[PDB]
Chains A and B, each alone.
Chain A
């Protein structure tokens, strides 16, 4: 929909910052085993532009739809890693500890409309995320 959304659950009662990077063939992600890639340690690191929004204990990292990828989620507490083969999308939190992280699958409803409103009732209608 709006984009590709990665949820980061943390222990802060506030709004931790998140910095997103992307890189291929870092140590342990090479297809033919350790150091079988074209640039040992990892190829070009790209900074990914994110739009962040917050609720208590949950950061929602909205990235452009073009970056959308599958993959294993690794939680290292200081950083979250979205590993898809050779590709890694790295999320670095500031001022909190990552509790759990995941690509948002169950997404919140959207076009909320109040119709047929009377003194005693109203009808709420929406659209799936």
Chain B
């Protein structure tokens, strides 16, 4: 993702370009410690566990759905919004 400048034999400011690439990587990467803010759509292939306080926006919009018949109340007909379990 990050834009690093290529390190080649014979290049002019080798030490300085290596320093800038190391500094770029150090400030753009998500690290295993400290509080941070991460931008972009993050898709996780494997399992994810949150030991701390998990915060998610709009949980009831996202995970619950209520469908009922107004005019009759005997036959509810609906198009499922996502893969679910009905009660």
Determine if B13 and A28 form an interchain contact, defined as CB atoms under 8 angstroms apart: yes
Compute how far the CA of A16 lies from the CA of B44 in the bound complex, rounded to whole angstroms: 55
Tell me the chain B residues, 5-60 only, with Cβ under 8 Å from chain A. 7-16, 18
Which residues of the other chain, B, contact A33 by a CB distance below 8 angstroms? 9-12, 14
Compute how far the CA of A75 lies from the CA of B7 in the bound complex, rounded to whole angstroms: 26
Q: How many of chain A's residues touch chain B, expressed as a range? A: under 10
Min C-beta distance of B16 to chain A, whole Å: 8
- Chain B: residues with Cβ within 8 Å of the partner, total of 11
Which residue on A lies nearest to B7, using beta carbons? A34
Please report whether the interface of chain B is mostly helix, strand, loop or mixed according to DSSP.
loop
Which residue on B lies nearest to A36, using beta carbons? B10
Which residues of the other chain, A, contact B9 by a CB distance below 8 angstroms? 33-36
Min C-beta distance of A29 to chain B, whole Å: 9
Compute how far the CA of A22 lies from the CA of B16 in the bound complex, rounded to whole angstroms: 21
Which residues of the other chain, A, contact B15 by a CB distance below 8 angstroms? 27-28, 34
Q: A28-B16, A34-B7, A34-B10 are in contact. List 18 more A-B contacts (CB 8 A).
A: A27-B15, A27-B18, A28-B13, A28-B14, A32-B10, A33-B9, A33-B10, A33-B11, A33-B12, A34-B8, A34-B9, A34-B12, A34-B13, A35-B9, A35-B10, A35-B14, A36-B9, A36-B10
Q: Which 3 A-B pairs have the closest CB atoms?
A: A34-B14, A33-B10, A28-B15
CB pairs A–B below 8 angstroms (8 shown): A27-B14, A33-B9, A33-B11, A34-B8, A34-B10, A34-B15, A36-B9, A36-B10
